[PDB]
Structure formats: structure tokens, C-alpha cells
Design an enzyme around this catalytic site. Structure first.
Site: not given
Ligand SMILES: Nc1ncnc2c1ncn2[C@@H]1O[C@H](COP(=O)(O)OP(=O)(O)OP(=O)(O)O)[C@@H](O)[C@H]1O
Ligand SMILES: [Mg+2]
Ligand SMILES: [Mg+2]
Ligand SMILES: Nc1ncnc2c1ncn2[C@@H]1O[C@H](COP(=O)(O)OP(=O)(O)OP(=O)(O)O)[C@@H](O)[C@H]1O
Ligand SMILES: [Co+2]
Ligand SMILES: [Mg+2]
Ligand SMILES: [Mg+2]
Lengths: 768, 768, 193, 192
Positions: A21, A161-162, A260, A528, A626
Site C-alpha cells: 500500500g 502506515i501499518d 481494524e 531544540n 533568525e
Molecule cells: N510471502 C511472500 N512471498 C513473496 N512475495 C510476497 C510475500 N508477501 C508479500 N509479497 C510481495 O508484496 C506484495 C504485497 O504484499 P503486502 O500487501 O503484504 O505488502 P506490504 O508492504 O506489507 O503492504 P502494506 O503497505 O499494506 O503494509 C505481494 O503481492 C508480493 O508481490
Molecule cells: Mg507498503
Molecule cells: Mg502489510
């Protein structure tokens, strides 16, 4: 030493992509990576759509030049694009990807994403050698190429953002999301109603309650639902009970923060709608509920995130270069404001363990797995949200006074609220000293109660009042008041004067017995400049005020006219605001006091920017501290740049002024203030226990200190040993950490500056 | 012949005010006005908590209100009186119980602030009045003689709902505020960058009214809208998806679909947002996110427009309530073309029900017409700008219409240019953009602009085209040559006062230089609101909101026990519009303007007056000053005076807004204002140019060089020539400024005794 | 005029140049007094006077600055007279000394040295080893710095009792104002010694 | 100094008071020239000179104001000399006239009246509205109409200012190396 321009990456090819995301600050990140790479002589490539674009290959991979990432600092989301790639979950995807990468000579990778993107990257590193076999075997790659492109340098940046990638403290995008969240809450709090209202807000966090938690103590929520510390059986009635209790303490607006992934002691989902009905049915209050959508990824990235993302972009590139064939694929992060590299696998592991721990209802383990920080924040929040009935709090018969000293700083109130309540919860009798030392001497001292500091969290300025007058001249009267009110400890939430204040008092602890008590200071000024702490309460707020003003200044069109802005910032002699603000807003130059300059340097920067204005840039930015110089004033610089730009661009001057020093505190500060004030009170509490209840005389050197952010921890430092490292003439610490970042801000503006990158990060393992 | 307010006493009368239905930003501003206006005319006003509920319940739900009751609630959303839904009032028993409590307190004068419902219910209560007193005297609950005394029920209503669902009312209190909340979200999503195509589905409010949805749509140039009054034609599903992909191909990388709550198809079947989500996810597969903007549309602080509107109505309600006779129909105070009017309740309640009937009976075309001439127009204008017909279906006119920006930049000029350019193209003209105003005009900086070139300009601040304050005076020779070479047949200037001056000059030159014998329309755009011939300017609302926003912040910040007074300088040149209206909107004690000369004595008086308020009731004082209200009594002068005189009771803070907050993003009101007049202006040009082809290319008549502005109650074109008579060219402000009639209001609201010429008050009129 | 908080220059200068008013720190004033003096002078300008003069001490007030007063008198005079502002500044602090000063400096410095000579002929930790040779009662007497603290306001750096202030009511009645004049310090018959 | 756009006062005053530099409008300058003169004077201050002088025309530049120049010279002089700023102002525009002026005024006003007297011994022509002044080597009457040609109405100064030929003199006397067009120098004539 170990400089940057002594770590050439010439010949290497770096690929950067944003996955998962989107999260505010990602652009700031790639901007940093792209430019830092290009600067060290490497050649960086964009990889659109995260892993998808890598699998697809082709035009989804383009070389990026210095202007590619131009003016994307203040932009949310990612210009590279980020998505979910299902193909990469499979062995066929990984293969197709490794092919396109090899087809472009890219063996150095920088993945910017969350827990997923990162674990996936980790796995890709493992299968690397294995994938090249299968590719050479099926004749899709050269037999010898399987040796050349044999080492895969992978480095990751947590950008989600998680904040669910266990092993890492902070992540890019969270502060920004928090801003979005608190903005909504603040918008609801300025609304007045006669009848009781209850607001149920559902923030993000798949299976992570971090957002939910910090959101909660950012607005003093009445209750929180976290996937890591689910509510105990029979909470339905317990919650309703707490709401009515708060209702009786005059809190006319309840706020319930729901994550969530909120669940009960049996992993059963706790919906927001269930919470709605619960109160509507049991209490019948006007209940409204909003599921803050994707809107948490929107808006402009906060100052914190822009800076964080930039520092990480550099760390990613230098890490990528110093990477050997046998060096573990790592993840650049920050620990206590210090750059660190953590091996991917170790983090990917713990991340999975936290999930395991939660599925197995071993919640107490999940909480500990999130981090020492998370566990603490959780406690601190509970501590401040749930007051035990008076009779269950063993009194200490100690009067602890809290006071504000120095220029007002956003978040002093959040600090006082936190200190007062933790105090009360520890059995002390709390005393509020109004108008700082001035009022202290004039006996303006009164008792403050638990509900008296309610809702102070989000309030700007100083409700208690604050002055710059120091205790020296009135050591007498104070010692008197301190006696007639039987004060046992002092908690000063203030700025530099609070420190000069503490030093004067630790001197008189010689001629006066009333001063032989525990005293802690908590750094609060937009400047600071407090010795002993890398950060101040109110500093983030001010920094965000700067980036906000610069954003507006840019987004406004002037037609075909090129425009350059000169902006004066606060800070006195401390160029923290000017410098960090400059970095965060992407300024060409930031004139500060700590780095002297003459008319020649000045003339040079004008020519340098005049050039950029003639071509690439459409809007130029210049910041000025400043008091960076008394002769080269803001107007001077404005006049100079104006004359030299004649014909190529016009100028606009603008002094932020001290009017934007009392606005509402940013999420980061309301939490900073809440957090240190609590640790400080905890210290006072413990120091008093040394008295055994029959009162002690505190003479020791470490019983009058500054609680601050130091090495990588919040440590108490006796005011006495801080004198050594402080310049009392300009009231700034002798060694300012952020100065190491100055050469970064410069090269990012297309200047050639020496960058001492010795303090860079290095391999380390996740601390359990 | 003229009526004044202090002459029309209400001594002896008792007024009851209550807020019903959903809450809406501006309600407090309304009751604040009612309470104080009543108290001022000698009446005695009473609060009635919880809307009708509190009236039925009676008892403590009805308390007398004094001057301080409504103190400092101007900048507060919701209602301190509280508003709810009363089921009891739906019944005959409720109405009876209520009429009893009212009679029990001597309240026969009622002021209901709410929406369609609250108002129709009030209407009915008026009917049953006599009938209810019978049943009450009959059952011995009231005096037999009291049935004669309290026999006349004076009812007056104020539409205060964010729906705007009450027929016969142009704008209602709360809508502009809701729109702000809505556009804020949209803006937050637009600053987020993604590489792949995204589609945002936003569901705004409006039970069975698509007003909100509509204005929201052309406030952000939505791709599609769903209204209950003009449902989508059968087979829209594919039509929409087709439009989205088309826009996608024109480089619009973010689609925005605005969905009204009551969105329905040609058969009253609900069109859910989720259906829209799937529709695009399935057919186009774009990254689609959807948020149901909740009650959050009632949150935040009330916009400047709403605070002012609510105040003007509060007065109108009280004077209407007094001049009400026993045989005078219960009315509803409103505004028509910026003019106060009273509409009989029943007539409105009726039409309101007719619109619903019309929709249930699928007679949608009738519903659209029933909403108002305005609504029907906005709808068309939106469609016109959102749906472009394929080039071949647009019969070309072979006319080149040039658009240009002249004067100081004003928020919304871009929305104006976008609207003019597209309406032009849709009318078959070839559009020409003149950059950097007259300066660039003379320097031949003219280029052609296309339909997609002005995409997304709606919400952009500043002037993308560029704008200068230069006058064509000295370059008639140069400009004329440019029109001749480029073949410019019509001219549309979007600008301020100087733009009017340009038009005066060009007129005089059309004799010597023939090239100026084409149509020329001017559209008022300056933060000043000083253009002769228009009551409003594009950019004026934005500026006003900048003011109230700065005052809000200044108040919400705590100073401890210290009393603080703020002196704020506003823009406007000689036109005290901003200063005055801003003062009213922010609740200032005084607003020094040019139009009302003052001396050191008046000055001294106001200081004493406010110094008094600071000693008691007020905690935070506010004083506004027009840039050029006086050359000797400067901002600093006044700051110094108030500072010295306040010594001991309060301190001062000075603050010059400055022209930096003149280029921020335009407020919803302005992006729509700009869009709307620019379109009507182009329509005029189109029609003028067509009679060229017939009537004659004889454009050497005053009537072909106009200023399109808000006049009487309409947007009428006025030849520049006849505006000279009513304009003071020395200070560049119209001779007769309508808003000045409101000045005495702002004063009495600040607790001053000022003569209030209330001759322009409203009077019974029937809805068109 | 200069002087910091000491309105000596402003006051005596005002008297010497014949000013209508001399705003000083030692005599606080408010907007009412201010308004009164403007009206008073505006009247004189309408008739008798052709050229009006108003002096202001550097720090007589922080809110009613030189410009403030300039702006006030300017607005109130509109129609009867115009204003001109002028800050002497510290540039005229280094010109050649007037005869009176070259002689004053010569004279005290000599008496002071005479004192040192006599003191160093006695050979110090006592309070009379450190003085301030200055004009007091009717003589140039040495006063130990220590006993001067009592009679000095260190906040504004001016003596607590300023002799010339007794002359202020004189300057006023000469400007056609009605001021109480404590003439107790007036002269009395003595014999020439 | 005063003068509006006319650097006469600034320049001639500079020459007369012996200033190191006189920034005027008629001779544009940039930050480099500025920097150069500071260094040049900073040098003289380090040795020979004990008191330095710099004049600036009221409107010689709108960005490089009096304060600007004061601030620049101040910073660059740090350690070798300090600055003092001073604006003559228009208060010294109404003092008693110098002997030269009371006589100048007396003399031209008389010749002008003499002209009027003679003209009235006999007016829609263009040589009936002159401007009596010092030209070539005489006080000649010049019709306002033919003066427009040689005047810049934007800055209200004549297009050709004679005293500018003296500017390079003031400079070399300050120890600068300036080109000195000495064409207008004198030449052997017989006493007339
Ligand atoms: N176990 C995995 N094996 C291979 N690729 C992965 C795996 N997990 C995540 N990915 C890669 O990342 C993509 C998106 O996964 P995910 O939504 O968990 O990423 P994220 O950065 O943690 O998401 P978020 O930004 O919402 O936290 C998957 O579609 C894949 O391409
Ligand atoms: Mg991300
Ligand atoms: Mg994630
Ligand atoms: N037909 C009616 N008869 C009597 N009372 C009515 C009637 N209609 C509405 N009301 C009064 O108004 C209350 C609320 O109704 P409603 O929500 O329609 O008001 P509203 O102003 O339209 O709300 P909103 O501001 O959300 O549009 C009812 O509970 C009742 O007290
Ligand atoms: Co365990
Ligand atoms: Mg309502
Ligand atoms: Mg309704």
C-alpha cells in the site's frame, strides 16, 4: 572518518521500487535514493508498480536522472506507483523478474514497502542463485552471466502506515497517517453539543494496533481496541461503565479508537458497529462512527516522514554499496535516532512470530514481540486512561510540583497532563505553579487534580503559563514557597532557561536546604537547543509549520514567472528548525549560525540557484535562521537574491514569526510530551521512595537532571555534567547531531559538499 | 420613511429559540445572533435545549439566556443548545405537552432553527395552536383567560441543515461548511501520487437532495455524479465505465465519482456506492477505493460564509418576529441573491413535499425544476464541463476567443479559466490563452488552450495563466497589433479593479484602433471585492476564510491567566470588505476601515470599551484593521495605543496577515463561483458573436463591453460605461457598498450601541 | 533627543528651545494628556504661533514612540498645520565640545587628580577610597559610590531625585499651560561670600 | 545624500569630501563591483587611512539600499574597522543659503526679469517659454520644447550630465584605476 565521496559506486546499477500500500514519504524516499545513488556515481533505475513492474519488465523499468525525482518531496503516495503482485508470490514470477533484472544489469535492489514486500524480498534473495540456474538451464540467460550477476544486494526501507515489520521501531508513513487521524478527531472536538456524545473511530493496522495505540494517547481516548492486548471477557459492560464514569467527570465527548484487526480473547472480530450499538443500547448517548478510510494515506507527508525517508534513502544507498557477496540482505532503519541495519530474515521471522503469537492467543507474548517501546506506550496509555479509585492508591504524602519555564512550546500541556496524572496515580499530591518562576516567586501555586488536566493533550500554548525569568534573583522567596508548601520534588517542562534554571538551583542547594530535592527537566522549545536531548517537545510541530507554509507557497501559480522565496525561521541561534526544515521542504540553501558564511559563499549560492531557475526549477526556496548573522539579515539576503535574479526570477520574503508557535501540537509532540513527562514522574516517584517516607536530603549530582534523547535511549543526565558540552553564550549544545545531515540537504540541492558519513548505520541484530 | 432597530422595541415580549434536526455548522452563530439581537431590542430570550424534545419535556430544558450565554460560540460547530429528533412532537400529545410548557413560561414568540422537517413540524404547530389551547383549557391544565392572552403564536424559521432540502431557499446554514469538509477530503486524495490509474468513489450527504452532491462535483471536476433529481439513464453502467476510460486516456490519472446518499435510477432503485465500486473494479480494473464521508460533514469549524449568513439571518428572524402581527403568516427568513427575504412557511413546506412527490412519481424533470433555477443551471453547467462532445459534433464558429487574467492574483482564477475555456470549446470557438495579463498581451505571449489543458485547474490556487496589475494604457499600439495578428474576436478578462480600468481604456480606444471592436466581458476576481457592479468577487470568500482561520487559532491557544488582545491587519486596499465582514465572522470588538473615518476620540472610546470587557467577560479580544483605513493611525499605532491602555489588564499581539495568504487553494465557494460566472460570461460572448454573423460586426457600443457581476438579485451584465457614475476612482472602491449596512450589526453584537438602519430588512414575498 | 531614561536633555532642551511640550520618562503620561497637549498647541497654531516645537525623550514610553506622537499630532493638526519628525540621533554626540564642557572637563579632572595625589600621599579598603567627584549641594564634593546606591534607580539608570525636575513646571507655564509650580527652592537674601 | 536619481550631490559631494566611493544611479553597479570596493577600502583602512568615507545617492538602487551597503561594509570590515550609517535627510535642505547661492539666485532672477521686460515690449510662439540656465559657457534661454529631446522623464534627470566626466577623477584620487576621458580638457586661448 569514512566519507561518502570515498565510497564510489561507479559501475553499479541500483533498482528502486515501492511495493504494497502507498504511504506518505515514499517519494521523499526514492528522491533520496535516486539522487544519492547518482551522486556516488552509480546509475539508478525506477521499477514501476512494485514487484508487478519487475515481473512484467520492459518499460516498467526506466533509468532515472536527477530531475526524475524533482519536486516530489511534498507529495503523498508514490510517483513510481505501488501495487500488489500476485505473480511474485509464485516461482514463475520470481523467475520472470530475475530475468528482466538481469536483462538490465541490475544486481543492487532497494525495496521500499511493508512487512510483506520485505519478506518477499528476503525470499527472492534466497532463491536468487536457484533462479539463475533454472534460467541458464532453460537458455533464457547467458551461461557466464550466471556468475557475473551472481550476487544480489538487497536492502529495504519499511514504508507502510501499518508499522507491522517487527524488529523496526519507526516506519515511513505512520506520522503522516497519525496527522490525518488526529486532524479528524480535532475536527470533531471543536464541535459543541449539549448532550453527551460518543465518537467511535476506526483507524488502520491490519493485525497491528500501533496506529490505534498512538492515536489513542494522542487524543486521550476513553478506550482502545488492539489486536495485541484484546479486551478481557466481559468488557462490553466494563466499557459502558467507563464511559458513564467519564461522563460524570464532565467529559462530554467520549472517543473510542478501534483498530481494524480488533479482536477479543478468542480472535473473534470486534466490529465498530458492535461498539456503536453497545453504547447506543446501554448508555443511549449520541453515537456516531466513521471508518477512516484510505484517507489515512492522503494529505502531504509530515516533516518527520520527509526527513525520516530522506535519511533512510541515503542509508539504503551506502548500505547497498558496502554490501559484499556474503553480507546478509538487510533493512535500514532507525534506533533511538541512530541509523541501523537489520538482517531481513531476522525481521521477517519475528514479524511472523507476532502473528503466530496472536493466533495462539498468547497475547502477552505478542505485546512483548512488538517492542519495548510498544509495550511501554500501551502501559502509559492505560495508566492515564484508567484511574484507580482513590482508596486503592496508597498516598505518599509528598507534594510534587510541576511548572512551565521558557518560551511556550506546542505540547507543554500534554506534558503537564501526563505528569499530573501519573503523579496522582502514584499517590502524590500534585501542585501546579503558574506563570513559571515569575509566578513561583509570587506564590501562585495551587493543587491540580486528575480531571483538571482533562483534554489538555491537544491544546497548544501553556495552560499553566510560562515565563523566561530565571530563579537566580529570587532564590530566597522560592526557597520560602518551597518550604511553606512542603514541596518534595520539581518537574520542569521547559526550554533552555529551564536548564539554566536547574543549574542555578543546584548551586543554591548549598545555601538552601529546601532545594535538596529531586528535579528533572523535560525539553520543550521549538528551538531544540536544550543540552542533553536530541529532540524537544514542540520541535516537530514547528517543523511541520514550516513545510506547510512551503507547500502552499509552491502549489500557487505565478504564470510564466519564476519565483524564489526567502523564509526566516525561529530557533534563536539554533539552526535546527532552519536546517531540518530546509531538508524537509527541499530548500536550495539554509543559512544558519552554526555554519558561518561570507559574501562570497552567498554570491556563489545565488549564482547556483539562479542557474537552476533558468532551467529545471520553477519555484526556488531559501531558509534563514533568525540569528544566523546580524549583518546579513533576512532583508539583506532578500535584496541580494532579488538583484542577482533580476531578469530570471523575482523574490518574495516571508518571516514565519512567533505567531505559529502556539498552534495545536502535532501528533508527534502530543505523544512526545505525554511519554517523557511520564518517565520523568516515574523517576521522581522512585527518588522519593529513597526517602522511605521520612524525607531525605538529596545532595547527589544525579538528582537534578535533564531527561532527554541521547545515545539511543531516553536517559537522565545530571545538569552538572552537561555544562561541559554546552555553549552558554549562544545557548546551544556544543555538539549538534543534526549537523551531520547538513551536507545531505546540500547535495540534494545539487551542490557538491563533503559528506562525513561515518555515523552511518551498520549491521546489528534485532533486540528481543 | 426609513426604519431603525432601536425604534422597534420588543420590550415585554419573550422569545424562545431552539435548534432541531441534525446539527449544522453555523447554528451557534445563529443563536448567538438571535439571543443578543433580542436582548438588545429589549426582549427577553429563552433557550430550548434539544430542539422539540426539550420543549415537550419542559422544565429546566428551558432557561433564560443572557448576553454571555452565547459568548464565544461563533467559531463552534454543532449547537450548544443541542439538537435532536423528537418523536413525541410527531404526536398530538407531544404538541400539547409542549404548548403547555411554552405557555407556562410566557413564550409566544418562537424561532426554530432547523431543516425541512423541523420547519414543517413548526408550521403544523402553528395551525394546531388555537386548537391545542382549547384542549388544554378544557382539561384544566391552563387558565381559561390565558387561552386569550397567549392566543397568537409568532413563528419564524431559519433553515439550518447541511442538506438544503427545504424548498424555496437558495442556500441554507451549514452547506458551505459541509462542502469544505468534503472538498478537504478530495484535496487530500489528490495530493497523493500513484503510477497506476485510480478511481475514488465518494458518498456525500443529502437524504433525497443532490445539491451537496452536485456542488461537490463541480468543486473538484468529478467525472460523474449521481443525483436523486436527475437519475442516470438506463444502461448507465457501461456508459460510466466508458467515460472513465476516456478520461483515463486524456491523462486524467484519478477519477472521482460523487454519489449522493439518495442516489437512484430511473425507477427509484437505490444505487449503492458498493455497486459503483464493483462496476469499475470489474469492467476497468482500476485501483478503486470508496469512502462514505460520515457525519464528519457536520464537523470542523463553520466557514466564514456560514458564520456571516447565520448572523444576518439571526437578525432577520428577530425583526421579523417583532413586526409580526396576529394575521401575518408564519414565515422563513432566507436570502435571495444576497437580499433578505421572508417566505411563508406553508408555501415552502408545500413545494418541499412536491419535489418528493415528483421524484417518487418518476417525474424527474419536474423535480429538477422544483429545486430552483439555480440548481437546474448548476446541473447543466456541470454536465457541460464534464461531458465533452466528440469534435465532429461541435459545429465550429471560426472565432478566436481569448481569455486573460488581469490584476492581483485571486483564489479561483484558474477555476474560472478552466470553465471559460471549456464552455468556449464546447461552443465551437478556438480558445486563446493570454499569459501574464496585459504585460504578456503586449509582448505577444498568446497561445491556444485545449480542453484537457485546463484539466484539474478547479482546485488550484494562484494564476496558472499568470496575472499582472499593468494597464493597457501605454501599450494600446502593441496590444491592438496582437489581436490583429492572432485574430482575436472576443475577450474575457477574469480579474479585479484594474481589469475594469483596462476595459474602460480599451473602450475609449476602439475608436482609434478598430481591433478593439469585439465583445469584452469582465468577471470580478480580487480578494478585495471592490469591483464596481458586483456584490462579490472570486477569491473574496477564500480570503475571508483565511481570516477566520487565523482568528480561530489565535483564540484556541492558552496564555494562562493572561488576558490577550489581538490587532490584525487585513488586505483590501481601501475596501474594508474583508476587514468588516471578517470582523463580523470572527467576532471582533472593532474593525477599523476606510469607509468609516475615525479620530483619536473614537479610538480611545473603543479601547476603554474593550478594556472593560477584558476585565470581566472576555478572555481573548480581537481587533481588525484595514490596510489603508488611515495613514497616520497605522497598524502599529493602534497596537501601541491598545497596548498602553491595556497595561495591567491585558497585553497585545500584533499580526499582519500579509499577501502570502492570497495564493492558497481556493475555497469551495470560490471554485464554484469562478466556474459559474465564467460560464455565463462565455455564454454571453457566444451569443454576441453569433449576432455578429447576423446583426452586424458593429461592436462600437457600450453594451458590448461589460462587467458580469452580482447585482440586485441577479447576475447581470452592466456596461462599464454606466458604472463610472457609481465608482470612486481615487480609492478604487464603489461609491455605494452594500455590506456597509451590516456594519452596525457587527457593532451591537460586540455590545456597542449603534444606530442600525434596518430598512433593507426582509418582507413577505412568495417563492418563485 | 538622547538621554536614555534621563529626560534632562529633553526637558532642559525643551526649555532652552521654547518647546510646547517635552515628553519624558520621569513624568508618565497617557493618551488623554497627549490629546490635551495637541489641542492646546493646535490652538496656538491657529493664532499666535507660526512654528510649533515638541521634544521627546528616547525612552519616555515604549508604546507612545516618536512616530506615534508624530502620527497623532499629524492627524489632529490636519487642516491647521503639518508635521515634520526628526530624530537627532547619536551622530551628534561626537562633535567638538562646547566651551563650557572643555572647561568643565578640565576643571573637575584637575580637582579629582588633586584628590588622588593627596590620598596616595597617605600611604585602601574602606568605602571612601572609591568615590564620584560631582556637583552636589553647592560644591564639588567626593561621595563614596557606596552611599549613592541608596539614591539611585538601577533599573532605568537615573538618580532617584533629579534636581532639574523642579524646573519642569516653569517650562510649562512659559508655554501657556497652567501647571502647579513648587517654588519652595526659590532664592532668599544672603550675604556675598 | 539627496538628489532623487541625480547623483550630482552624491558625486560632487564625494569628490569634495574625499570619499572612497560614491554609489550613484547614473553608474549601475552589481554585487561584484560592490565587493571589490569594500576590499579596496578595507585595504586602505589596514594601513594608510584612519577614517573611511562612502556616499550613496538616495535612489542609486532599490535593492542595494543604504542599510544593505552599511551591512555589507560592516561584515567585510569586521576585525579591521567598524561602520556608522548616516542619512543626511531633507532637514538640511532648509538651512540658510550659502553665499554662492544667494548670489546665484540674485543674479539669474535678475537676468530672467530683464528678459521678461524685453519680451513685454512687443505670445503663442515656442521661444517665449524658456528655461534660463547655465549652458555652453553662457547663461542662455532655451525653449522648454527643445529640451525634451535631451531629458529622461522617467528618472527626471537630463540625458547628458556634464559632471559625470569628473567621476573618473574622484576615483583615481581615491587610488583607483579608472579610465579618464580628458577630451574636454582645456586648451590655449587668449584672454577675452
Ligand atoms: N510471502 C511472500 N512471498 C513473496 N512475495 C510476497 C510475500 N508477501 C508479500 N509479497 C510481495 O508484496 C506484495 C504485497 O504484499 P503486502 O500487501 O503484504 O505488502 P506490504 O508492504 O506489507 O503492504 P502494506 O503497505 O499494506 O503494509 C505481494 O503481492 C508480493 O508481490
Ligand atoms: Mg507498503
Ligand atoms: Mg502489510
Ligand atoms: N411532520 C412533522 N410533524 C411534527 N414534527 C415534525 C414533522 N417533521 C419533522 N418534525 C420535527 O423535526 C424533528 C426532526 O425531523 P428531521 O430530521 O426531518 O428535521 P430536519 O431539520 O429535516 O433534519 P436535518 O437537519 O438532518 O435535515 C422530528 O423528530 C420532529 O420533532
Ligand atoms: Co509466553
Ligand atoms: Mg438540522
Ligand atoms: Mg432534513
Amino acid at each position: 572518518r569514512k566519507f561518502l565521496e570515498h565510497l564510489s559506486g561507479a559501475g553499479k546499477a541500483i533498482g528502486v521500487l515501492t511495493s504494497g500500500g502507498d504511504a506518505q514519504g515514499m517519494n521523499a524516499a526514492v528522491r533520496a535514493v535516486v539522487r544519492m545513488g547518482i551522486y556516488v556515481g552509480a546509475k539508478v533505475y525506477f521499477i514501476y508498480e512494485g514487484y508487478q513492474g519487475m515481473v512484467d519488465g520492459g518499460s516498467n523499468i526506466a533509468e532515472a536522472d536527477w530531475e526524475s525525482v524533482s519536486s516530489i518531496l511534498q507529495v503523498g503516495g508514490t510517483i513510481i506507483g505501488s501495487a500488489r503482485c500476485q505473480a511474485f508470490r509464485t516461482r514463475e514470477g520470481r523467475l520472470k523478474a530475475a530475468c528482466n533484472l538481469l536483462q538490465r544489469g541490475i544486481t543492487n535492489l532497494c525495496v521500499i514497502g511493508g512487512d510483506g514486500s520485505l519478506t518477499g524480498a528476503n525470499l527472492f534473495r534466497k532463491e536468487w542463485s536457484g533462479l539463475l540456474e533454472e534460467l541458464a538451464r532453460n537458455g533464457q540467460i547467458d551461461k557466464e552471466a550466471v556468475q557475473k550477476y551472481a550476487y544480489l544486494n538487497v536492502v529495504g526501507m519499511v514504508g507502510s502506515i501499518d508499522n507491522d515489520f517487527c524488529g523496526t521501531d519507526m516506519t515511513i508513513g505512520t506520522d503522516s497517517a497519525l496527522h490525518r487521524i488526529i486532524e479528524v478527531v480535532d475536527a470533531i472536538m471543536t464541535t459543541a453539543q449539549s448532550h453527551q456524545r460518543t465518537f467511535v473511530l476506526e483507524v488502520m493496522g491490519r493485525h497491528c494496533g500501533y496506529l490505534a495505540l498512538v492515536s489513542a494517547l494522542a487524543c486521550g481516548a476513553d478506550w482502545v481496541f488492539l489486536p495485541e492486548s484484546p479486551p478481557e471477557e466481559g468488557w462490553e459492560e466494563q466499557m459502558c461503565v467507563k464511559l458513564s464514569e467519564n461522563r460524570a467527570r464532565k467529559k462530554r465527548l467520549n472517543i473510542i479508537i478501534v483498530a481494524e484487526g480488533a479482536i477479543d480473547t478468542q480472535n473473534k472480530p470486534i466490529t465498530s458497529e458492535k461498539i456503536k450499538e453497545l453504547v447506543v443500547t446501554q448508555l443511549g448517548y449520541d453515537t456516531r462512527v466513521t471508518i477512516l478510510g484510505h484517507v489515512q494515506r492522503g494529505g502531504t507527508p509530515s516533516a518527520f516522514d520527509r526527513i525520516l525517508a530522506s535519511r533512510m534513502g541515503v542509508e539504503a544507498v551506502i548500505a547497498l554499496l558496502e554490501a559484499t557477496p556474503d553480507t546478509p540482505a538487510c533493512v535500514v532503519s532507525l534506533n533511538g535516532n541512530h541509523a541501523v541495519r537489520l538482517p531481513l530474515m531476522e525481521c521477517v521471522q519475528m514479524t511472523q512470530d507476532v502473528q503466530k503469537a496472536m493466533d495462539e492467543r498468547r497475547f502477552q507474548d505478542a505485546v512483548r514481540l512488538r517492542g519495548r517501546s510498544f509495550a511501554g506506550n500501551l502501559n502509559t496509555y492505560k495508566r492515564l486512561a484508567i484511574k484507580l479509585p482513590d482508596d486503592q492508591i496508597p498516598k505518599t504524602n509528598c507534594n510534587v510540583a510541576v511548572i512551565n519555564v521558557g518560551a511556550p512550546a506546542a505540547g507543554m500541556n500534554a506534558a503537564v497532563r501526563s505528569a499530573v496524572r501519573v503523579g496522582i496515580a502514584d499517590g502524590h499530591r500534585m501542585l501546579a505553579i503558574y506563570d513559571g518562576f515569575d509566578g513561583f516567586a509570587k506564590g501562585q501555586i495551587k493543587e491540580i487534580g486528575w480531571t483538571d488536566v482533562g483534554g489538555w493533550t491537544g491544546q497548544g500554548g501553556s495552560i499553566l503559563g510560562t515565563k523566561r525569568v530565571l530563579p537566580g534573583k529570587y532564590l530566597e522567596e522560592i526557597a520560602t514557597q518551597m518550604r511553606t508548601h512542603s514541596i518534595n520534588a520539581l518537574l520542569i517542562i521547559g526550554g533552555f532557561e529551564a536548564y539554566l534554571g536547574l543549574l542555578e538551583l543546584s548551586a543554591a542547594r548549598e545555601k538552601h536546604e529546601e532545594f535538596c530535592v529531586p528535579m528533572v527537566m523535560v525539553p520543550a522549545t521549538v528551538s531544540n537547543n536544550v543540552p542533553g536531548s536530541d529532540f524537544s517537545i514542540g520541535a516537530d510541530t514547528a517543523l511541520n509549520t514550516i513545510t506547510d507554509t512551503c507547500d502552499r507557497i509552491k502549489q500557487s501559480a505565478s504564470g510564466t514567472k519564476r519565483r524564489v522565496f526567502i523564509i526566516e525561521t525561529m530557533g534563536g541561534y539554533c539552526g535546527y528548525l532552519a536546517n531540518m526544515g530546509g531538508l524537509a521542504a527541499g530548500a536550495d540553501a539554509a543559512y544558519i549560525f552554526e555554519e558561518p558564511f561570507d559574501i562570497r559563499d552567498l554570491q556563489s549560492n545565488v549564482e547556483h540557484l539562479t542557474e537552476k531557475m533558468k532551467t529545471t526549477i520553477q519555484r526556488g526556496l531559501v531558509l534563514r535562521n533568525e540569528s544566523c548573522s546580524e549583518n546579513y539579515t533576512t532583508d539583506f539576503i532578500y535584496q541580494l537574491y532579488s538583484e542577482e535574479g533580476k531578469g530570471v526570477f523575482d523574490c518574495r520574503k516571508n518571516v514565519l514569526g512567533h505567531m505559529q508557535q502556539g498552534g495545536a501540537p502535532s501528533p508527534f509532540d502530543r505523544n512526545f510530551g505525554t511519554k517523557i513527562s511520564a518517565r520523568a514522574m516515574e523517576w521522581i516517584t522512585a527518588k522519593l521512595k529513597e526517602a522511605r517516607g521520612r524525607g531525605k536530603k538529596f545532595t547527589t549530582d544525579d538528582s537534578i537532571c535533564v531527561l532527554g534523547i541521547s545515545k539511543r535511549n531516553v536517559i537522565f543526565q545530571p545538569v552538572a555534567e552537561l555544562k561541559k558540552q554546552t555553549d552558554f553564550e549562544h545557548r546551544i549544545p556544543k555538539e549538534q547531531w543534526w549537523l551531520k545531515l547538513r551536507p545531505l540537504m546540500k547535495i540534494l540541492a545539487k551542490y557538491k559538499a563533503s559528506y562525513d558519513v561515518s555515523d552511518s548505520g551498520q549491521l546489528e541484530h534485532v533486540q528481543p
